[model samples]
Target chain A: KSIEDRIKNFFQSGGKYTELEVDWEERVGREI
Target chain B: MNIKQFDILYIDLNPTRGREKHNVRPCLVINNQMSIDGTNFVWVLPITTRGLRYPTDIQLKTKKGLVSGVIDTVQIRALDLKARQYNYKDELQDNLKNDILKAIKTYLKPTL
Candidate 1:
């Protein structure tokens, strides 16, 4: 999904998610 | 690491040079997951209980609708989550999140 779509979903979730697991590579990546 | 947009977290914005929001405080993440994944940075607006609310600021409230703090939408910034003492605090309800999105939209694209 696109960023806008993801954001829309988040807005509709009504605080359903208190935490989200992100991909290590996608978030941390190779530290430099 | 687990994080997402609209997730309220405590972040240390310390060592601020000037008028930047100082100290470790609660901040609302504004960037979508895609942006966070792509940039390795989280865009946020710090939450404060001090100042009077501004036109672009959204009021944070509890489920009982008690005013907790103000989400200073105009004071937006980007921070590396790994570099700061970031801690998940709470998830804002949809009403507040929607209001925040509206405030940010108006801030970025003001009507004249």
Candidate 2:
């Protein structure tokens, strides 16, 4: 398979994409 | 020959010098001396630089010295393309991770 297809499959696996935790406070703090 | 000896020799012979009348000789000698007196000395000759120019598949001799080994344009182009692709991949991955994190935060805390 092509690299793009492979990457797409990887990113879509394990219900990971939508389930990722992004705490805004933690992310904003990191930016600071 | 247990002892390792590294030597850096630079030879830039101007035409005026009598040595320049004949063929150019750029020599690099590496000699390894062992601790034991009777030990054999290892001698290595590496052609680091020759004829004051890079060596190509075909040798071109000029008035001063040989000029050859032009950098292959195709190879340089390929390297540049690879570097661009690497940078692109880095940015793409960062964006993907950020999107994933945003989705999670939206689901968890909705109003903020």
Candidate 3:
């Protein structure tokens, strides 16, 4: 399924999720 | 490691010299899993209790003192990080999420 679709239906079945298991290579050093 | 859309994370928002985002606060993930997985960076909007100062700002009740914080859609930021912990909520009500999405859309892709 597409990511957006997954997001749309994430919370349906007890909120499906793909565990985010990674460290940030770098912080947001730049300002917008 | 349970990151997902509408999940709020507490992160360090320092580094910007001026207008520095308040460090160590909740931020709402705005990107989809596909983009988050494909790239090192991800989209998020900082949540602040600095008062409603913009039309695009949408407020949500957060755990931080049970205060109403405004979702700074105009300040939508791309952080090169996905390691978010201390999640505020597992999921937002679809209606609330839709409202936030609409505000962000109007901010980033305003129509004349």
Highest lDDT: give the candidate number: 1
Model 2: residue B2 alpha-carbon error in angstroms: 17
Steric clashes per prediction: 0, 0, 0
In TM-score terms, which candidate is top?
1
Per-prediction CA RMSD (Å):
10.2, 28.0, 7.5
Q: What value does the lDDT take at residue A13 in candidate 1?
A: 62
Give TM-scores for every candidate, taking all chains together and pairing residue i with residue i.
0.64, 0.16, 0.59
The DockQ figures for the candidates are 0.04, 0.01, 0.09
Interface RMSD of each: 10.7, 29.2, 8.2
The full ranking of all candidates by DockQ, starting with the best, is 3, 1, 2
C-alpha lDDT of all candidate models, in order: 0.68, 0.24, 0.62
The candidate that achieves the highest DockQ relative to the unseen native structure: 3
Rank order by TM-score, top first? 1, 3, 2
Across residues B1-112, which tens digit of lDDT does each residue of candidate 2 receive?
1222222122221222233232332212133222111122222222222243422111222223332222111110001111111111001122233343343344457464
